[PDB]
C-alpha cells in the first residue's frame, strides 16, 4: 500500500538499528511502540504554487511542508528550494530535525518543507514572485507558536525576507514565524557564525573527554572544507583557541597550507571577500605572497591532501567524506571529526570511524560525532532568535554565544552519559556519540509523546 521513499526509509532503519544495538528496548521495551508512531508525520501539506516569470508566463511548482513532531515544541525545520525536492526527501530531512532539535534542550519539534522551484537561472524578481506565491498557501498552516520554518538549500536571508513580508501582510502580524531574519526585523547575532562555532565548541568537549583534559584545540592541526560562513567561523574559532587551520575548499578545488603553519584570520577574511561578489578561493593564491604559503589542487577535496591532521571539520556539502577519505584520515593520525555541513560524512565513513573506535582503546581511536549533536549550533540559534522575538529584545553577541556554549556542552554530555547507560563500551573504549545521541533524541521525544498521550 504505502509508497516507496528510499531516503526516508534509509534513515528510519539506520536509526532503528542503533536502538536495537543498545540495551534501550530491554530497560524500555514499550518504546518500540513509539518508533511506530514517531515515524509517520503528524501532518504533511502539499500545495500548488502558481507564479509568473519576467516574460509573463504562468509557471507551476509543488510546495510541501512536513510537520513531523510537535511533542517538544512548535514544528521547526527549514525550506529547501531545489528541483530534486519531494516528500521522501523532505520527510528524511524532517525526520532528522526532530532529534537534532530535541538534543538542543530548547522546546522545538521537527519538520521540513520547500519546493522543486529551481533558483538557478531565475532573477530576483522571479524569486520574489515565487516566495510570495508559496507563502500565500503555506501561511495558514504555520506560525510563531505552531510552525517556525527557516533557511536551507535554495532559500537564504533573501528569500526569508520575501517570505516574512508576505506572511506579515496576510496574517497582519509581526511575529517570529521565520528564523534567519535580517538585523532590523528580528534577526539574532551569532546566526551567521552559529553552526561553525557550535561544531568547534562540541569537539572541544570531545577532546577534553578522550584526553582527560590533556589536550585542547591548541596546537592541533584541523582540516576544514568549505568557505561559507560555516567554514569561516569554525576556522576563526579554532584560531582563537590556539589551533592551526590547514585547509579550506570551494566547489572548484581546495587550498592547503604548507609553507607556514596555519591560515591567518586575514587570509580567511580575504576568502570572505572572494565569496561576496562571486569570485573563487583560487583567486587568493597567485597574489600577495599567498603563492608561497598555499598549494591549490583544483578538482579535489582536502581529506588526503593535508598530511598528518588531528581534527576534521567538513563544512561544505553533503556526502563530502567517503570511506576512503575516512581511512585516509585515520591513517593520517586524525582522532576527532564532526560535521559543520549537513550529513557531510557518508554512512561508509561513519561505519569506518565507529569500527576504528571499537577496535582502538582510549585516545588512539578516531571519534566521530553525528550532525544531530555536533552541527546543532545553527538550529540552537534559530531557537534563540525565536526566544528573542518573543522577549521583544535583541541580545548582545556575548549573550547568544554564551547560551550556545551552554547548549553545546549539554548536548555532548547527553550523548556521552546515555551511551554509557545503553551502549556501555568496553574497558577504555570511547562511548558512542552516534548511538548515545540517537538514543538521547529518541528518548526525550518518545517520553514527552507518552506524557502527552500520542502513544500508550
> Using CA atoms, how far apart are residues 227 and 225, in angstroms rounded to an integer?
7
78 touches Cl ion by CB under 5 A: yes
Give me the helices (H) in 360-396, please: 371-374, 377-391
150 touches a copy of itself by CB under 8 A: no
Binders of Cl ion in range 125-144 (CB under 5 A): 140
Looking from the CA of 324 toward its CB, the CA atoms found within 13 Å total 6
Give me the helices (H) in 69-123, please: 87-103
Binders of Cl ion in range 368-407 (CB under 5 A): 378, 401-402, 405
151 in a labelled binding site = yes
Of 204, 195, 277, nearest to 232 by C-alpha is 195
Q: Residue 90 binds what, of Cl ion, a copy of itself, none (CB under 5 to 8 Å, by partner type)?
A: none
172 touches a copy of itself by CB under 8 A: yes
- Answer for which of 46, 156, 264, 280 binds a copy of itself (CB under 8 A) is 46
CB atoms within 10 A of CB 139: 17
Query: Which residue is listed with cell 521495551?
Result: 29
168 touches a copy of itself by CB under 8 A: yes
- Answer for which of 7, 12, 28, 47 binds a copy of itself (CB under 8 A) is 47
> Using CA atoms, how far apart are residues 385 and 94, in angstroms rounded to an integer?
20
182 touches a copy of itself by CB under 8 A: yes
> Using CA atoms, how far apart are residues 211 and 152, in angstroms rounded to an integer?
36
> Using CA atoms, how far apart are residues 260 and 258, in angstroms rounded to an integer?
6
Q: Are 304 and 335 in contact (CB under 8 A)?
A: no
Contacts of 337 (CB under 8 A, 6+ apart): 311, 312, 313, 314, 321, 326, 329, 345, 353, 366, 367, 368, 369
101 in a labelled binding site = no
Q: Are 162 and 139 in contact (CB under 8 A)?
A: no
CB of 128 to a copy of itself, least distance (A): 5
- Answer for which of 9, 137, 351, 399 binds a copy of itself (CB under 8 A) is 137
Residue 361 annotated to the active site: no
147 or 325: whose CB is closer to a copy of itself? 147
Residue 455: enclosing H or E segment and its boundaries? none
> Using CA atoms, how far apart are residues 18 and 415, in angstroms rounded to an integer?
13
**Catalytic choice (112, 181, 220, 237):** 112
- Answer for which of 16, 37, 274, 297 binds a copy of itself (CB under 8 A) is 37
186 or 196: whose CB is closer to a copy of itself? 186
Q: Are 200 and 231 in contact (CB under 8 A)?
A: no
Q: How far is CA 356 from CA 277, 327, 353, 413, in A?
A: 43, 9, 5, 22
Of 310, 354, 342, 348, nearest to 329 by C-alpha is 310
Binders of a copy of itself in range 351-390 (CB under 8 A): 383, 386-387, 389-390
- Answer for which of 136, 195, 225, 232 binds a copy of itself (CB under 8 A) is 136
112 in a labelled binding site = yes
- Answer for which of 15, 19, 24, 72 binds a copy of itself (CB under 8 A) is 72
Binders of Cl ion in range 143-162 (CB under 5 A): 152
444 in a labelled binding site = no
CB of 253 to Cl ion, least distance (A): 25
- Answer for which of 3, 29, 121, 213 binds a copy of itself (CB under 8 A) is 3
Binders of a copy of itself in range 106-125 (CB under 8 A): 106-107, 109, 116, 124-125
13 touches Cl ion by CB under 5 A: no
Q: Residue 209 binds what, of a copy of itself, Cl ion, none (CB under 5 to 8 Å, by partner type)?
A: none
Binders of a copy of itself in range 280-299 (CB under 8 A): none
314 touches Cl ion by CB under 5 A: no
- Point out the annotated binding site for substrate: 76, 97, 100, 151, 382
- Point out the annotated binding site for NAD(+): 195, 229
- Point out the annotated binding site for succinate: 76, 78, 97, 100, 112, 191, 382
Which residues are known to be catalytic?
112
Amino acid at each position: 500500500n504505502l509508497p516507496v521513499e528510499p531516503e526516508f526509509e534509509q534513515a528510519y532503519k539506520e536509526l532503528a538499528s542503533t536502538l536495537e544495538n543498545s540495551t534501550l528496548f530491554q530497560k524500555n521495551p514499550e518504546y518500540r511502540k513509539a518508533l511506530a508512531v514517531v515515524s509517520v508525520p503528524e501532518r504533511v501539506i502539499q500545495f500548488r504554487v502558481v507564479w509568473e516569470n519576467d516574460k509573463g508566463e504562468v509557471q507551476v511548482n509543488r510546495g510541501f511542508r512536513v510537520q513531523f513532531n510537535s511533542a517538544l515544541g512548535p514544528y521547526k525545520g527549514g525550506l529547501r528550494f531545489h528541483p530534486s525536492v519531494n516528500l521522501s526527501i523532505l520527510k528524511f530531512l524532517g525526520f532528522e530535525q526532530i532529534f537534532k532539535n530535541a538534543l538542543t534542550g530548547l522546546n522545538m519539534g521537527g519538520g521540513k518543507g520547500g519546493s522543486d522551484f529551481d533558483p538557478k537561472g531565475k532573477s530576483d524578481s522571479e524569486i520574489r514572485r515565487f516566495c510570495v506565491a508559496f507563502m500565500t498557501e503555506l501561511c495558514r498552516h504555520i506560525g510563531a507558536d505552531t510552525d517556525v520554518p527557516a533557511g536551507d538549500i535554495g532559500v537564504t536571508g533573501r528569500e526569508i525576507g520575501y517570505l516574512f513580508g508576505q506572511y506579515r501582510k496576510l496574517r497582519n502580524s509581526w511575529e517570529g514565524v521565520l528564523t534567519g531574519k535580517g538585523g532590523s526585523w528580528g534577526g539574532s547575532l551569532i546566526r551567521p557564525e552559529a553552526t561553525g562555532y557550535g561544531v568547534v565548541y562540541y569537539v572541544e568537549h570531545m577532546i577534553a573527554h578522550a584526553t582527560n583534559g590533556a589536550e585542547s584545540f591548541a596546537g592541533k592541526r584541523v582540516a576544514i572544507s568549505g568557505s561559507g560562513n560555516v567554514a569561516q567561523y569554525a576556522a576563526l574559532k579554532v584560531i582563537e583557541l590556539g589551533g592551526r587551520v590547514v585547509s579550506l575548499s570551494d566547489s572548484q578545488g581546495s587550498l592547503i597550507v604548507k609553507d607556514k603553519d596555519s591560515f591567518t584570520p586575514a587570509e580567511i577574511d580575504a576568502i570572505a571577500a572572494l565569496k561576496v561578489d562571486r569570485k573563487q578561493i583560487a583567486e587568493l593564491v597567485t597574489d600577495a605572497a599567498f603563492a608561497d604559503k598555499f598549494t591549490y589542487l583544483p578538482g579535489q577535496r582536502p581529506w588526503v591532501h593535508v598530511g598528518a591532521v588531528d581534527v576534521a571539520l567538513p563544512s561544505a556539502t553533503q556526502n563530502e567524506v567517503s570511506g576512503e577519505e575516512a581511512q585516509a584520515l585515520i591513517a593520517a593520525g586524525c582522532k576527532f571529526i564532526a560535521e559543520g555541513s549537513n550529513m557531510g560524512c557518508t554512512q561508509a565513513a561513519i561505519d569506518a570511524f565507529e569500527a576504528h573506535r571499537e577496535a582502538n582503546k582510549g585516545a588512539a581511536a578516531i571519534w566521530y560525532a553525528p550532525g544531530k549533536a555536533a552541527n546543532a549550533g545553527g538550529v540552537a540559534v534559530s531557537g534563540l532568535e525565536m526566544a528573542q522575538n518573543s522577549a521583544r529584545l535583541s541580545w548582545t553577541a556575548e549573550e547568544v554565544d554564551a547560551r550556545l556554549k551552554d547548549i553545546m556542552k549539554s548536548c555532548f554530555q547527553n550523548g556521552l552519559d546515555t551511551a554509557k547507560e545503553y551502549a556501555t563500551p568496553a574497558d577504555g573504549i570511547l562511548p558512542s556519540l552516534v548511538t548515545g545521541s540517537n538514543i538521547a533524541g529518541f528518548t526525550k521525544v518518545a517520553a514527552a509523546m507518552k506524557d502527552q498521550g500520542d502513544w500508550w
